[PDB]
């Protein structure tokens, strides 16, 4: 040993620590990009609630139908009395990556029985751990069937000595959403005294049409998707809004607010709210704004570090609640702490507001392969939360180097960001042209960052992305030609083609159009007048950019109003919306073109002490 060896060791150690810090910063930047991209779409989707809410203010106050299914069909048998052996068979059928399609009769039976059974449950389900001496809470699953199977394998099947509480968001984000819902309903039916379900913000017919669930159902069952969707929508109606644990701990999906009172939620007619983002279907009784706001606050709220209660403009819906309102709510309802599952976390769990708000998230690889680790909570008789972690698909993850493991996530984040940025190409180019008064082709770094922030409004750290969105740029000037070429790549267009967008209401929810055109009814005879029609389109275009421009819709009525204004003329009246959507799609398209098997053993796990985390 000598001093030269010490010098070499400390030099190498410094270099390695510097590179580790650089990788950590890259990870944080990618996480920020993912979170901002998700929030930007949820916010835009949430403005339909505001549109409905202010349109309300302005206007005056056992049948057999299933048919044989084309393609390969699994001959699995499911009987009406669900037992334990059916669960194993169901898991075995759904385990395979191919040949996992059940007969529509059994799906209809399961959905109908689950809908019938869920009606008797109260709004808030009381859970007692005195007998079981143990209770388990899981977070969002979002179609991650392998994660649910891993949880079941590691913790055992639910039973009277091992209950479960699934905290919403069962579906509509992954590629295998239907299987998770069917398995959860089957487990609830087989064990009615040990499985509790909570409604989530994604348990909505409006949200499903925008995040690919309806597309998956239509693709899997082309000949029967309508009735399956109707049964699923019926099931969403009766899911409990929350759960109370040991009469001391409250479990809700989104959170709460300053005006939220459990003495009011327990008396809400849960059956009215088939959907959350659009008004409930009442029987002529004019609706109450408070109860709808109560449910929306429960489902969509988010926590914040700062004090006070302000409206959650980041996600476009719900309210931010700080430690003060949390403490006031806990003191008012005599509770200990509130468990939450809305927000994904890098480790799958976090603490907020002095260990009084516990966030959980049970979906591994939520954004891309390696984004985050799932988690679930084990509570003992004293309610001390033991946290567990797991990552699925470890075998495919271990076949890459660390650099490649970072590169896949980086490429996914960049692809998603460029796909989202593709929409504003024309305005972005115009803004870049304006900031170059001498058409030299190069603009300053500050101007580039300002233009990007003004156009995209995502709030990302653009200066760190300068060398990736616009590679090969100096420290003072950036050419916009390379940036514009990035969004103009063919593969980006192909990827953006599959991505659904806002509007498309008729394909998404015809019930939304029915709700609008029943709300604008000044009289109950079902007849409307064009001035009200003009006001409705004015308010619609006031919120949704480039909706109809008040021209196509008005011209369509002028083509149809042979006998003047009157009744909503059924399907042929909606042909106006049909042709408007077709014309808009063709107009934008012309302008664009004119230029392995599931394996629970394939995972890694870790158990964390409640205070070590």
């Amino acid at each position: 040993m000598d001093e030269n060896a010490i010098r070499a060791a400390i030099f190498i150690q410094k270099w390695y620590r510097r590179h580790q810090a650089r990788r950590e910063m890259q990870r944080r930047c990618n996480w920020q990009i993912f979170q901002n991209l998700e929030y930007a779409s949820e916010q835009d989707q949430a403005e339909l609630y505001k549109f409905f809410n202010d349109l309300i203010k302005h206007m005056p106050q056992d049948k057999d139908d299933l048919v044989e299914e084309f393609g390969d069909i699994v001959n699995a048998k499911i009987e009406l009395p669900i037992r334990k052996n059916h669960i194993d068979l169901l898991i075995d059928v759904f385990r395979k990556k191919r040949g996992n399609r059940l007969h529509p009769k059994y799906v209809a039976l399961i959905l109908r029985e689950a809908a019938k059974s869920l009606k008797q449950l109260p709004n808030i389900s009381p859970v007692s751990t005195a007998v079981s001496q143990q209770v388990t809470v899981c977070g969002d699953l979002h179609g991650k069937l392998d994660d649910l199977l891993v949880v079941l394998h590691k913790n055992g099947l639910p039973s009277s000595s091992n209950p479960y509480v699934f905290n919403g968001d069962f579906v509509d984000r992954g590629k295998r959403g239907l299987e998770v819902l069917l398995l959860l309903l089957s487990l609830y039916l087989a064990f009615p005294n040990a499985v509790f379900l909570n409604r989530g913000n994604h348990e909505d017919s409006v949200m499903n049409a925008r995040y690919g669930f309806i597309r998956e159902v239509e693709s899997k069952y082309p000949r029967n998707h309508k009735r399956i969707l109707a049964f699923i929508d019926e099931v969403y109606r009766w899911l409990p809004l929350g759960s109370v644990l040991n009469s001391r701990v409250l479990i809700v999906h989104g959170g709460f607010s300053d005006s939220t009172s459990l003495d009011l939620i327990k008396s809400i007619d849960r059956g009215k709210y088939v959907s959350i983002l659009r008004p409930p279907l009442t029987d002529g009784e004019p609706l109450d704004k408070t109860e709808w706001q109560q449910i929306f606050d429960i489902m969509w709220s988010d926590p914040q570090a700062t004090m006070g209660c302000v409206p959650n403009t980041l996600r476009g819906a719900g309210v931010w609640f700080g430690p003060d309102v949390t403490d006031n709510f806990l003191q008012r309802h005599r509770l200990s702490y509130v468990i939450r599952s809305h927000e994904c976390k890098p480790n799958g769990h976090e603490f907020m507001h002095d260990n009084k708000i516990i966030t959980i998230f049970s979906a591994s690889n939520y954004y891309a392969i390696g984004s985050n680790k799932g988690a679930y909570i084990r509570l003992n008789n004293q309610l001390m939360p033991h946290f567990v972690q797991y990552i699925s698909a470890a075998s495919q993850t271990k076949r890459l180097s660390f650099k490649q493991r970072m590169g896949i996530v980086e490429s996914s984040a960049l692809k998603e960001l460029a796909v989202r940025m593709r929409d504003h190409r024309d305005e972005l180019e115009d803004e870049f042209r304006k900031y170059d008064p001498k058409d030299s082709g190069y603009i300053s770094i500050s101007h580039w960052c300002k233009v990007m922030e003004n156009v995209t409004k995502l709030g990302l750290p653009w200066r760190l992305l300068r060398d990736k969105l616009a590679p090969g740029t100096d420290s003072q000037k950036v050419n916009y030609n390379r940036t514009l070429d990035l969004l103009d790549t063919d593969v980006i267009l192909e990827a953006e083609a599959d991505g659904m967008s806002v509007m498309d209401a008729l394909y998404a929810n015809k019930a939304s159009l029915v709700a609008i055109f029943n709300i604008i009814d000044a009289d109950n005879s079902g007849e409307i007048t064009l001035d009200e029609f003009e006001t409705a389109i004015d308010l619609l275009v006031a919120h949704m950019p480039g909706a109809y421009s008040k021209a196509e819709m008005l011209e369509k009525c002028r083509m149809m109003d042979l006998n003047g204004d009157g009744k909503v003329d059924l399907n042929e009246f909606l042909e106006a919306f049909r042709l408007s959507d077709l014309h808009r799609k063709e107009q934008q398209d012309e302008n664009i073109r004119r230029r392995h098997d599931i394996d629970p053993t394939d995972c890694e796990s870790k158990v964390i002490d409640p205070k070590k985390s």
């Binding site: 040993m1 030269n4 060896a5 010490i6 010098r7 070499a8 060791a9 400390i10 030099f11 190498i12 150690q13 410094k14 270099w15 390695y16 620590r17 510097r18 590179h19 580790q20 810090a21 650089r22 950590e24 910063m25 944080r28 930047c29 920020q32 570090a305 700062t306 180097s401 660390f402 650099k403 770094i445 500050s446 960052c449 750290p461 653009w462 200066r463 760190l464 420290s475 003072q476």
Partner: protein
Amino acid sequence: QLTEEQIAEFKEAFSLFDKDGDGTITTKELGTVMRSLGQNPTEAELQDMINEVDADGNGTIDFPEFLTMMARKMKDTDSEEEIREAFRVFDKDGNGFISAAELRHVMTNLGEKLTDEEVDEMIREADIDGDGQVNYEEFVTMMTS
């Protein structure tokens, strides 16, 4: 003192670690933020730097003192060429295929020892082959690029 681009780049890189958004971060992450901007001080340098900047043991540092600290530290820098000789002096016979056992042994005990996680990751990435020996040249070339 700092360049016109630096005074904004540092602020943008500062917000990625602030939990409350108030411009103040915990002192335990100083060795990460300062390292991420091209600097390579040891934990002894970190202790010396925190002693001169913290007096009441609050554990909070805001933007101006970080800017002054980085301006003071930036005056000295090293290139990537000096990394090669550090690995060269660790090869006792010039084979270039130093095995993992002594590589783990040296820097977990000599100099300023790292924790178990750092070496776990390091000789997990470096020791691709199962022979237990690591080629330093390819390691440095692939990590530096």
